[PDB]
């Protein structure tokens, strides 16, 4: 049965594809006709943060909206208190070919990881005025791309190697192990419950894991080139995308199908990463053209510009309570524009 | 193991959905309930927008220490050179100089870094590089038409548009007894090479028309931004690492003739 | 951790000495320092203070001119010279840590002290002197000039704890935040000028004195004491 299986494949994607056909009764571009629109959006910068001599890859806030903590590659992690502009904490590493970072919910570790097929977990508020390492979680084949907190004995990890996993820190071993994916796994983004997450890939597909059980449950397509970048919604029924095409899109998870995407004729450089807002209404987004843009998430209509770099962003951020966004770039300095 | 897929497919298609006039009306209903808590929408009052005592004093005085010793550490950093180094097999890419594996040496107090990588999205982290070296075998008949592709999506990058490319053509030891002995013919893999000739004839001719393949694709468009380096290596050779600092100053050379506009 | 003093004797008016305190067990040199004296039957009483890395010291004025404070750092010591003594110089010697960023926590670990023989400000007032006390429920109260509350939103007032022979403690830090290896039958409460620490829950080894401390502004002026009986 060599091709007598081949046959029953193309069978179901015809039919989940015609199973798919009904639900598409209208568009949201059509019923978002009669709405405000939300204007010029005027920001400027408030604080510019400076200390580090390389490029810069990864931000993370903190739950308080206060601390957050940041990496580059020069080799170091820095805390920073952003009412301020001072230095809480300074860490060296041991790799300096790191590329993500993470903050810990509760405030006591944070986590790093690069081309070293590790990461590392690093305790905070520990007696005698110190900062050392907790454990160190080996199992990956390839390099590491993201990493996301859940409690402070649990953590997710996606790599290049076609893979994501579960860990327990205090045993240290992967529990579970999700595969299905054909190329290398770029993004990851919980969800506000912490019962499943979304996950983008290499190969142009997003999949949906569920965390107790251990396997896909959707798979999303419509992209021609890979996927940097991915993010769930507030209201956590819904997902944004970024690819190198130049175009974003907004999926859907009880509708298996897209809704709305946001393209531009003048726009052909790759999205680097994609944040929502607080409420739901605007979704920022950077681009390889060293700025930001600001898209209407109803309208798909632009509405603003954040042009203060002189490099590309690769990274942002939106705090929990919706007050400030913070960017980084290859040019060595954070921004906080409010 | 082809009913695995199939599996995962029947268990996909099994779903139940509802209709999209719903599943973005309920989309659109969530931002009118919580409009009026987005700050970046409505702008807060100025006087409301967060962005001495004597342990905030101390707090400063503890944070102006860092930058010094960040700024020290950097500043003393900031001397040597680095390479990357490429090459996917049977060439001996380990053995010219004498996770991520790493190697340091230097000539004349001056330290260069060489990585290895033990390639399509990782290459951006070497953006700022002095140089690539890439390892070619010049007695494998059959994969030369591989290192060439190899050779040409890696000078036809997006990102290494101005690293040049340092070239080695590995193992010319095992070429002259290849060709000398003559079981082996090069035209039964390369028709062209019948009207060639040379501008030990049969081995420089041989290796010659080796060397113009790579060079023609270096020259083909590169718009005179980066070049392309090449030499003949051999299995053991001593004097191999003077000819990467003699590269490296003539591309520090030519990069400096481009700042102070002197071109 | 550990803070062991030395120094001490008997000594005759006119004279001089010199104390020396040696650390074991973390990071000295990231640490702040203080000298702090209580009288053979009195309180406790602020006198030197010297930061992390020697750049900002601060004396008491009324021991201003003689006295000197100096931490040497590799060796892991601090020290404090003395010169023409008074009468007025018999008390017992502490050492003090603290540290300052966002969040911490200063004045946590106190150490073992010395005895030597020798024969505007604000002011804190500990109204009671002493209450009986089992079970039971109680509340204590400190009271300043001006209010503490600052413009940041922190309020500088600390509560400590001393039992009989022994070293003092560390309780709540800033007027609401309980201290690590503290269990949560004491509890911090207050305003501005109007604090009350509500222990619940009484049980044994609770014994002792109290006092309420300020941090706004130098000096650092200590109290009289409250004093538990059972």
């Known amino acids: 049965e060599l091709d007598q299986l081949r046959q029953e494949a193309e069978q179901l994607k015809n039919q989940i594809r015609d199973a798919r056909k009904a639900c598409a009764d209208a568009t949201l571009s059509q019923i978002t006709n009669n709405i405000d629109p939300v204007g010029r959006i005027q920001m400027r910068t408030r604080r510019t943060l400076r200390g580090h001599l390389a490029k810069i890859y990864a931000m993370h806030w903190g739950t308080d909206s206060r601390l957050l903590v940041s990496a580059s590659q020069d080799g170091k992690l820095i805390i920073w208190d952003s009412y301020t502009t001072n230095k809480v904490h300074a860490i060296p590493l041991r790799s300096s070919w790191v590329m993500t970072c993470a903050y810990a919910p509760s405030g006591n570790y944070v986590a790093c990881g690069g081309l070293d097929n590790i990461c590392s977990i690093y305790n905070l508020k520990t007696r005698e005025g110190n900062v050392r390492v907790s454990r160190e979680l080996a199992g990956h084949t390839g390099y590491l791309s993201c990493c996301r907190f859940l409690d402070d004995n649990q953590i997710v990890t996606s790599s290049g190697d076609t893979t994501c996993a579960l860990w327990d820190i205090e045993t240290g071993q992967q529990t579970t192990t999700f595969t299905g994916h054909t190329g290398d796994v770029m993004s990851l983004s919980l969800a506000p419950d912490t019962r499943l997450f979304v996950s983008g890939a290499c190969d142009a597909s997003a999949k949906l894991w569920d965390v107790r059980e251990g396997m896909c449950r959707q798979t999303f397509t419509g992209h021609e080139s890979d996927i940097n970048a991915i993010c769930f919604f507030p209201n956590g029924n819904a997902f944004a995308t970024g690819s190198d095409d130049a175009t974003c899109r907004l999926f859907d998870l009880r509708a298996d199908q897209e809704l709305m995407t946001y393209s531009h004729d003048n726009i052909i450089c790759g999205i680097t990463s994609v944040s929502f807002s607080k409420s739901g209404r605007l979704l920022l987004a950077g681009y390889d053209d060293f700025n930001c843009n600001v898209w209407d998430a109803l309208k798909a209509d632009r509405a603003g510009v954040l042009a203060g770099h002189d490099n590309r962003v690769s990274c942002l951020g939106v705090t929990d309570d919706g007050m400030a966004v913070a960017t980084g770039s290859w040019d060595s300095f954070l921004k906080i524009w409010n | 193991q082809a009913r695995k897929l199939v599996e995962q497919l029947k268990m996909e298609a099994n779903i139940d959905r509802i209709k999209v006039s719903k599943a973005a009306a309920d989309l659109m209903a969530y931002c009118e309930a919580h409009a009026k808590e987005d700050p970046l929408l409505t702008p807060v009052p100025a006087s409301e927008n967060p962005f001495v005592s004597a342990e905030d004093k101390a707090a400063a005085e503890r944070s102006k220490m860092i930058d010094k010793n960040l700024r020290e550490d950097g500043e003393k950093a900031r001397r040597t050179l680095r390479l990357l180094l490429l090459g996917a097999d049977n060439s001996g890419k380990s053995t010219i100089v004498k996770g991520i594996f790493e190697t340091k040496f230097q000539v004349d107090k001056v330290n260069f870094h060489m990585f290895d990588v033990g390639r399509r999205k990782w290459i951006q982290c070497f953006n700022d590089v002095t140089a690539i070296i890439f390892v070619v075998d010049s007695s494998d008949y059959n994969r030369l038409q591989e290192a060439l592709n190899d050779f040409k999506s890696i000078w036809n990058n997006r990102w290494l548009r101005t690293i040049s490319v340092i070239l080695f053509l590995n193992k010319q030891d095992l070429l002259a007894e290849k060709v000398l002995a003559g079981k082996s013919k090069i035209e039964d893999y390369f028709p062209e090479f019948a009207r060639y000739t040379t501008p030990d004839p049969r081995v420089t001719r041989a290796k010659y028309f080796i060397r113009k393949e790579f060079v023609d694709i270096s020259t083909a468009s590169g718009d005179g931004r980066h070049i392309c380096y090449p030499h003949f290596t051999c299995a053991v050779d001593t004097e191999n690492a003077r000819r990467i600092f003699n590269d490296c100053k003539d591309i520090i050379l030519q990069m400096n003739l481009r700042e102070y506009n002197l071109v | 951790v550990q803070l062991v003093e030395s120094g001490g004797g008997l000594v005759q008016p006119g004279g001089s000495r010199k104390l020396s305190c040696s650390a074991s067990?973390?990071?000295?040199?990231?640490?702040?320092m203080h000298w702090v004296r209580q009288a053979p039957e009195k309180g406790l009483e602020w006198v030197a203070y010297?930061?992390?890395?020697?750049?900002?010291?601060y004396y008491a004025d009324t021991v201003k001119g003689r006295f000197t404070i100096s931490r040497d750092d590799p060796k892991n010591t601090l020290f404090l010279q003395m010169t023409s003594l008074r009468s007025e110089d018999t008390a017992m010697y502490y050492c003090?840590?603290?540290?300052?960023?966002?969040?911490?926590?200063?004045?946590?670990?106190w150490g073992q002290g010395t005895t030597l023989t020798v024969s505007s400000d604000i002011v804190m007032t500990q109204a009671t002197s002493s209450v009986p006390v089992p079970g039971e429920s109680v509340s204590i109260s400190c009271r300043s000039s001006k209010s503490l509350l600052h413009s940041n939103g922190n309020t500088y007032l600390y509560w400590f704890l001393q039992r009989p022979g022994q070293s003092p403690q560390l309780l709540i830090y800033?007027?609401?935040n309980l201290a690590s290896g503290v269990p949560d039958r004491f509890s911090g409460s207050g305003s501005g000028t109007a604090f009350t620490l509500t222990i619940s829950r009484l049980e044994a080894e609770d014994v002792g004195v109290y006092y309420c401390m300020q941090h706004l502004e130098y000096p650092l002026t200590f109290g009289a004491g409250t004093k538990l009986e059972l």
């Open positions: 800033r007027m609401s």
């Open positions: 010297i930061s992390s890395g020697s750049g900002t010291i």
């Open positions: 003090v840590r603290s540290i300052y960023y966002y969040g911490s926590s200063p004045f946590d670990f």
């Open positions: 067990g973390f990071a000295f040199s990231s640490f702040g």
